[PDB]
């Protein structure tokens, strides 16, 4: 299935069966047949009937503001409903041991994906081992989240080595507004990935509001944040290195506005193009891989294909 | 001022118009007036009308961490706009799993369903001058059951006995229920009861989506690979007052009769429309509730029962 990006401003409405964007120039027609989700970077007006249409065609829509920051998602009514699996997803959260199992699995796979990302490029990863060891010794999920963060930070280091352009380095991790080039790209890519995983969760019986590594408070989607940790090297990080090495993205692609950096229309479309094609890549697609690990979680929640060992 | 409400607020918008951001507050622009909605105490917005909005308005709600839920004409839930981060939604899914996997807590909730279902059955029969005493044995069995599976069985059997008593109110025997089981016989009455029940199930479901409850976890019914359970549980309470009252009234006044059915056995489109309109009329019909000492619509009664479960789940006013 395909992911639709709208950078142009206009009005969203269903035409017959299709989505139409009416701009101040002309009409853009996008067919819904193959569409899994929509990402809106432009300024758009829409009505509820348009949302009802998206809901019936099972297409979520993600909204980004002009600075390129993710504001939120319209999540359609779930068409995949399973009492048992939802029950299992929740009892696996409220059970402290079961929750720890899943969370540790998430972290463990994140670390290995980081480590082979680095080894694939013939970079010595030899650190992160202390973070891996600190991860096994942890007694609770919260400490695990902090360890995962410090490991990612250290791994972002060992990345920058292999970026020539100095000033195009991560330095240290910046939010909320990215304070330089690298983080702007990394934050944007991560965002695209969060929404991607989110759209994919919608294609399963899982509820995106219950995560494991990231605590479930009901202030946000969690599960998509958890799963995204696995795929950050393969999608975002390879994209970042590939993009900055070929100099396809340059200083012309950032705007000094906003007390920090934004990614412009400019690099947004370029980023989106490369990012997307990164999702079609195959041994099965990257996007199918994300769905597969979601499936693997579901198999786990109901007792098939356990993580770790039977105790 | 008389009453006071403690917590944040759910804004229900039934009016059509345009949703817009002006001040640090938002407004609905219809023709004629502007309806101003202060956001300060609002945790979420539920839109039943036909509304226009843009991304700038969504950016505002996102900044205020206020999600907005969308519902269609009939009030069925289409979807929600969730901000990146939003105010605590009070979503009860974890509390629900917790009272399901604990057999004592599950029993307590299921026993509540059965208890009320039985009393509603008895009241319906006594209002119509029919003997309800046969049902007493099932009430006692329900009380002595220590397993939920046993409890669903007892409730079903009670229902079937109840249905046999309902048949004494039916003049035309072509329209008698005879026996209704888990696989109902093919005849006029069971075609109606099945149809009415399905409508009720959908009604309870859409109302649950307007709450903090998740419909996929039930209590009296096993939570299994079935799509929705909780709606089935709650519907057990309202089957007499909505479905059964409607069934009797329609077949005895011949509003529904043999001209409304086809063998390929199903209710034809005219028979469906007549039933649906009357059904939708039933949900608006008001009955006396002595506990509040007022009259409420049946839709409110269902709403209230859902809120009762909500309060039970969080420990406030446990059953």
Curated annotation (Swiss-Prot), chain A:
Gene3D superfamilies recorded: CRISPR-associated endonuclease Cas1, C-terminal domain (1.20.120.920), CRISPR-associated endonuclease Cas1, N-terminal domain (3.100.10.20)
Enzyme class: hydrolase
Record-level Gene Ontology MF annotations: DNA binding; DNA endonuclease activity; metal ion binding
Cofactors required: Mg(2+); Mn(2+)
GO terms, biological process: defense response to virus; maintenance of CRISPR repeat elements
Entry-linked InterPro entries: CRISPR-assoc_Cas1 (IPR002729), CRISPR-assoc_Cas1_C (IPR042206), CRISPR-assoc_Cas1_HMARI/TNEAP (IPR019858), CRISPR-assoc_Cas1_N (IPR042211)
Swiss-Prot/TrEMBL keywords: Antiviral defense, DNA-binding, Endonuclease, Hydrolase, Magnesium, Manganese, Metal-binding, Nuclease
Binding positions for Mn(2+) per the UniProt entry: 148, 214, 229
Pfam family membership, one: Cas_Cas1
EC numbers on record: 3.1.-.-
PANTHER family: CRISPR-ASSOCIATED ENDONUCLEASE CAS1
Record note on quaternary structure: Homodimer. Forms a heterotetramer with a Cas2 homodimer.
UniProt record similarity statement: Belongs to the CRISPR-associated endonuclease Cas1 family.
Record function comment: CRISPR (clustered regularly interspaced short palindromic repeat), is an adaptive immune system that provides protection against mobile genetic elements (viruses, transposable elements and conjugative plasmids). CRISPR clusters contain sequences complementary to antecedent mobile elements and target invading nucleic acids. CRISPR clusters are transcribed and processed into CRISPR RNA (crRNA). Acts as a dsDNA endonuclease. Involved in the integration of spacer DNA into the CRISPR cassette.
Protein name (Swiss-Prot/TrEMBL): CRISPR-associated endonuclease Cas1
Lineage: Bacteria, Thermotogati, Thermotogota, Thermotogae, Thermotogales
Gene: cas1
């Amino acid at each position: 299935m395909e992911s639709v990006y709208l950078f142009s401003s206009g009005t969203l409405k269903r035409k017959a069966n299709t989505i139409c964007l009416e701009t101040e120039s002309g009409r853009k027609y996008i067919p819904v047949e193959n569409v899994m989700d929509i990402k809106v970077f432009g300024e758009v007006d829409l009505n509820k009937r348009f949302l009802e249409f998206l809901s019936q065609k099972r297409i979520p829509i993600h909204f980004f503001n002009r600075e390129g920051y993710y504001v939120g998602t319209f999540y359609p009514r779930e068409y995949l409903n399973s009492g048992f699996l939802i029950l299992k997803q929740a009892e696996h959260y409220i059970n402290q041991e079961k929750r720890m199992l899943i969370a540790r699995e998430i972290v463990s796979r994140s670390f290995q994906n980081m480590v082979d990302f680095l080894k694939k490029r013939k970079v010595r990863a030899d650190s992160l081992t202390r973070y891996k060891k600190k991860a096994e010794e942890a007694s609770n999920v919260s400490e695990l989240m902090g360890i995962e963060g410090n490991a990612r930070e250290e791994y972002y280091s060992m990345i920058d080595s292999l970026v020539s352009d100095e000033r195009f380095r991560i330095e240290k991790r910046t939010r909320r507004p990215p304070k330089n080039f690298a983080n702007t790209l990394i934050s944007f890519g991560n965002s695209l990935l969060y929404t991607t995983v989110l759209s994919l969760i919608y294609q399963t019986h899982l509820d995106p509001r219950i995560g494991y590594l990231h605590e479930t408070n009901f202030r946000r989607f969690s599960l998509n944040l958890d799963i995204a940790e696995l795929f950050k090297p393969a999608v975002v990080d390879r994209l970042f290195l590939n993009l900055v090495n070929t100099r396809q993205i340059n200083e012309k692609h950032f705007d000094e506005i906003s007390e920090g950096l934004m990614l412009n229309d400019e690099g947004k479309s370029l980023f989106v193009k490369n990012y997307e094609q990164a999702l079609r890549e195959t041994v099965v697609s990257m996007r199918s891989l994300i769905k597969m690990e979601l499936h693997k979680l579901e198999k786990h929640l109901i007792g098939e294909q356990v993580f770790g060992s039977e105790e």
